[PDB]
Design a protein around this ligand. Sequence first.
Ligand SMILES: O=C(O)[C@H]1O[C@H](O)[C@H](O)[C@@H](O[C@@H]2O[C@H](CO)[C@@H](O)[C@H](O)[C@H]2O)[C@@H]1O
Ligand SMILES: O=C(O)[C@H]1O[C@H](O)[C@H](O)[C@@H](O[C@@H]2O[C@H](CO)[C@@H](O)[C@H](O)[C@H]2O)[C@@H]1O
Ligand SMILES: [Cl-]
Ligand SMILES: [Cl-]
Lengths: 785, 785
Amino acid sequence: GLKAINNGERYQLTSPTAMPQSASFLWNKKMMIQVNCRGYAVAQFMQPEPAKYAYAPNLEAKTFMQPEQPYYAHHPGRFFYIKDEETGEIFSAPYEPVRSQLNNFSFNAGKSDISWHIAALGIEVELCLSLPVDDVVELWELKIKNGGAQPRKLSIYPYFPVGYMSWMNQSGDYSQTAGGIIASCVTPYQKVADYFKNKDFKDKTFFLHETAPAAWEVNQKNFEGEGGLHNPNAIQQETLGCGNALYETPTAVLQYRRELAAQEQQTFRFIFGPAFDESEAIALRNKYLSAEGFAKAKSEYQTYITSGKGCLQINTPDPELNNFVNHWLPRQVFYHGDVNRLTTDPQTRNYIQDNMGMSYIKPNITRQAFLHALSQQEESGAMPDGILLLEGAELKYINQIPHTDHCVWLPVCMQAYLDETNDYALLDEIVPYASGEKRETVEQHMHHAMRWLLQARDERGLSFIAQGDWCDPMNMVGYKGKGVSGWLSVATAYALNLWADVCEQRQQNSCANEFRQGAKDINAAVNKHIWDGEWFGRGITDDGVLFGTSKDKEGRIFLNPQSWAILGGAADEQKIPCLLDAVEQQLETPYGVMMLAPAFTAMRDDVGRVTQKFPGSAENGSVYNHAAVFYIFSLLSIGESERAYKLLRQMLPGPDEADLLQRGQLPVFIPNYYRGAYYQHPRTAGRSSQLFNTGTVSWVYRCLIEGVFGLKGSPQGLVVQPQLPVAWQTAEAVREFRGATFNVSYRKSSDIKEMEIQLNESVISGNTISDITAGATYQLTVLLP
Amino acid sequence: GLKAINNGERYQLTSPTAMPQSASFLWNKKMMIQVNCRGYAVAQFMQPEPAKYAYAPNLEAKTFMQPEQPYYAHHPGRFFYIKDEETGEIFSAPYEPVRSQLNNFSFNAGKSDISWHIAALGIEVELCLSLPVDDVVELWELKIKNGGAQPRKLSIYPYFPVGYMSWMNQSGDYSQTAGGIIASCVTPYQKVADYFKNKDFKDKTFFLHETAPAAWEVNQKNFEGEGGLHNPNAIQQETLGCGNALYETPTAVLQYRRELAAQEQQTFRFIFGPAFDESEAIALRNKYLSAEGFAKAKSEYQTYITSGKGCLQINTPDPELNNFVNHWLPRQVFYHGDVNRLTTDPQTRNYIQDNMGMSYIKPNITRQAFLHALSQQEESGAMPDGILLLEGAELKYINQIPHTDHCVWLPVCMQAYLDETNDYALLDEIVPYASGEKRETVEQHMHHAMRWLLQARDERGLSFIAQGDWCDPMNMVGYKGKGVSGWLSVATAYALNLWADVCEQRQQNSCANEFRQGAKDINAAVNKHIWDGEWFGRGITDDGVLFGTSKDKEGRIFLNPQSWAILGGAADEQKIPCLLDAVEQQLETPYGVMMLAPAFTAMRDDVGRVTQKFPGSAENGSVYNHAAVFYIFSLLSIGESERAYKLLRQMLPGPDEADLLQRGQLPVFIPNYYRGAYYQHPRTAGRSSQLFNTGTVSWVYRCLIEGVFGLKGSPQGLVVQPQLPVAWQTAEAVREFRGATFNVSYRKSSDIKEMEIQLNESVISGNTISDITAGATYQLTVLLP
Ligand SMILES: O=C(O)[C@H]1O[C@H](O)[C@H](O)[C@@H](O[C@@H]2O[C@H](CO)[C@@H](O)[C@H](O)[C@H]2O)[C@@H]1O
Ligand SMILES: O=C(O)[C@H]1O[C@H](O)[C@H](O)[C@@H](O[C@@H]2O[C@H](CO)[C@@H](O)[C@H](O)[C@H]2O)[C@@H]1O
Ligand SMILES: [Cl-]
Ligand SMILES: [Cl-]
């Protein structure tokens, strides 16, 4: 079973086998953790670079998680073994590592916690994890209850495996002073400079107990013996042996022995995390490890999540949509912009898109993100591939590989900010550039970004792609310096047309003419060189070849040039229907729209690394949600209301049981992708990546707020412009906007020809609420034909 | 139980639990594999850089093995499940993953193969692995026999898990055309240059069957189900489901169903390995996968190992020593110099030392190694940190961190070559330098190496250490450009005194005077600045501090300055006894001599990264065998025969049962270390690193041949100069030397005052056999007081 519980606070899954990859996440200012329904977990923290405290049993690569992460028996996780001392029978919570038969199982994803309830052998177990707002530590609460009529003698064993910490130095021992287990290592390195760099690393891992235990074990191998995780030797014996780890793989195992009366419950608290030293671990203990500590942390954490609750609550005839939108969407949006995915060098397009989403949550964060991003613009006008969030940080990984699309996002996403807040005054703020002494207004920075995009085009008027655009791994189209991008051209035309609208609003008329003319020139160049007769191609290679065309067997059509040709005006009214049909026939699936099709099955080396990913995974033809929402947004821009809604609603798994099972995901986040290559590999199509990091969600939230519900800001006020699906006879929303609240009721009426809006029960003319007072609440009735 | 079998060809261990980390290795021209007694294995191959075909279940770091490697349930390995179709009962060979009760267990390390015999449920299993000489492929032979009186119905399932190959792209399927399973991936990368670099990678993994199976499974998760490795779901059912892997972790599982008659045995062959494509896998199949293929490969492999059998066979009163020396030592020596540890940039001191060992096996290899190494000497005379073995290869890892000791090895190790072969004519060969147009003789290159060592010294006359010397991680003594090494100074004096002896032999008298004077000058500087009163210190820091002294609490004495002060003359007859006693009191242990003591327990940042390794592991105070054999060699150089023998013999585990259990190693190789920090952590002291890669063995073989048995070359012939331990009343050796054979019998006689040598039963004067004819055999009797 699977359903929302606790008035929307949590979402419960009642089988540990039906959806075995499913998971939820928690985060805070410095860390994140993905928790799998069976007990596996992946946790990363910032110090100020990424690190972990719970390691794999081998020397693992530096990485957070892979899409479709495989788990394996010794994967890091969070476990408790229960032993009936009278029978010797054992089970583990949450389900791994023993995988015994349970009488009850619940995995509860929470807004602010993650928890389980399980039962076996007549013993009822509860486990609850939460995080504080500002420190890196996991707060663990365990409850054990004898559910039967007679007393029961139990051994209870937390099992928090630390893993293989380091080949240079790893150990662990019990510390009575810290009150628990401290594992210790030295992160490996060879360069003397890295010793200085690594000096503040939190290379201890603690597992601390509020309640003193009967015994402990710190040696992984001694814990298992020949019985393994399934039946650990240390649990077969009466008492743990109290061993340590001396250049041996350490573990965190404690033992409590209890006689529990009929119906008696006992509570045990623990904290788990990284520390520089025992002093830090003790500081965390004193701060958190108590009923009062846990309560205060939970109260402060709930307040944090409430602070990000956003601006829209809905009541539609679809209760799955309601639950997702009201309870799950806002926190996922908030995570992205509040912590910027826990990287010190966010990819520029991610920093800008994620903070766009914050316009609807905490727009002062958005405002500062534009200021910060533009401070790092290059003197040429170009934007760097990443934005540095800390002094001394560096560009890493894909950010070192030259991509060309970084400027396009600036006006695209600033439009959402200006429409929502009306903060045109941001345009006058003065910020420096990455080098040189020039300090200029936001508005002048933006002019320079758009002059950059116009200048970074070939003799045909098409945008250079270098080693990629929005498609990160599309790296061999332009690596020789001539290849051009279909998507970036049509997106540039969009960007320039938006920015020209802003310039006109600001009385910067010469700029408006210049950018509008640029947009025309690009769209003309796209129509002459990129349009392929029924859809727009993807690009042109260094050697002059157009790809993403009907002559291509794989990669015959890409979604992105279509969406963005709609947005930027390359696609006129005659072409638009060709686009819609080509996308439906070649890209649409039951799990959503694929980003390209058919998926590539072998390298094509004038397109590049994207073609070597597994067909249907990631950029190679998945239902890549972020591309799907750009299409949805484009459909909204032309009033294709039914198509927009249908494709948006496909992004949410359920309630269909086959769909839920096939995607394998809890409906508590939107993942970066559901597997594509739907025609080529139907068995795996729809499978969830399980990755909660995705710029999808800022666009999905924008689409719902401005598009579907149609409650959009303008310089005059609140524009009412809904695109509800026709099936809905009625709906409600509550919109917070510019400090006021709008209680909106929508109803279809056969008595009218044209939408009619009533404010506080009297009819308005036009579609804008213009008199908005901070703290006031307004009743809006929107009657629709 | 543990003992030699098959006339020395193999070594058998009869418990899978008593020595669970124990292992043996095999290699060939392009690959190596360590095989653990329970079924785990680590295999690396060259293409021409290192790679693997059997992966961990996560994204693992690029690495071969760690010292004291921990295994875990999903570690790569080599397994076969047996199911009794009548009862449903299952077991696995060799022992993992099921860990059932067995009725019989044998792990057989071989010179040329690795094998097991096991029995359970009345079914007798044999498993045998070998490698061909020149291709990368594992040859697997499985035998299954019904040992009972009635027919038995069995399912037989090879389980060769492929692991997590790649986050970009991984898959696998059954191929009827190749005749087995092909897993496929794309090695991850981001830089366009890496696509071109990676084009010839063998990114498929094959598991091919000679005999067609009843079914197969390629999906790891489908294989396990909820039963895991302990009780795989796919084995509980009647037939495997024949699933594939589509961006899922692939595996190699087949199923055979057989009714076996009483006493009936059947044989099944498989090959496992990497391939570029199916064509390559089929080429390997046609070449190897047959009785005739396996036989021919085994015959050619045995011939290879016989070709490296070396120059000494012994028959002493110690049958453990005999077995090790005769059957295990030579192949371990041969591996090092024949394949240079399967790196394209061997560390220079390793390339020279490993090829020194080849002087006693295939000295033409040694000769070419000197030529190759010197061709890469810098115009200054300095030697690079590594030697490149392939065009386009680069220096990697520690080879990028400046160390200063690389020249010292040249005359140190060339001495062994010249004494063994008499090939002074090598000195006249002309080779270039790394840059420039200068081509000079070996001898002139060597003069330039020694002029380099004399020039790379500070105002006190002591050798600069930069970021390390022989001790790789000793990187903070001289990183500021002033610190100096105690060890390198005293070793330089040794090197110069050896080279001066060569110059004198070659009539290069001015060079001999120059180097002998250099050696005196260094030894004087060592005695004035390094000698600490009872032993020699280790170095002096950039800020002028002498460490490795009695004022140091940790790192109070290091072994190396002592050994090499004996060799190079810094230690006179008055100091020598102080050295011997300090080493015995502070460094000697029951498992051998520690390289430093007490071990460091925290960073000391004017010494460096060595002090951060776990105390007792690796360079931080282990029984580091290679340092131990330098001491042994030094002891031999001063006729400390009993001490030399005792400490050499400690390097070989057994026959004492407690010793064997505590080290945990099969006595079929010498590991790089046995754990030290004997006073500080006795529980773990002696534990084997299990690492067969070690420059120890070329020195141990030299010590036995020239020192203990005393059969040493000179320009006149064979010098007889034994240092047998006093316990031995008699011993024999057979020495191959310069094309002749010497059958040597040693006997103690109270009837003599001085050793007496008889050649073919008549007494010689002096101690040199000078008339040596190629192909002849000589009887030597050596009578000793
Ligand atoms: O780790 C992964 O597989 C993915 O994790 C997160 O979802 C990322 O957002 C993915 O990278 C994103 O790819 C798109 C398409 O190439 C880019 O437009 C975006 O800026 C980048 O974050 C990552 O693949
Ligand atoms: O991987 C390891 O732990 C070890 O593997 C092999 O045994 C190597 O030979 C070890 O490195 C060696 O260290 C010594 C002492 O610092 C050096 O003198 C030698 O050149 C280097 O190979 C390695 O630690
Ligand atoms: Cl794209
Ligand atoms: Cl040393």
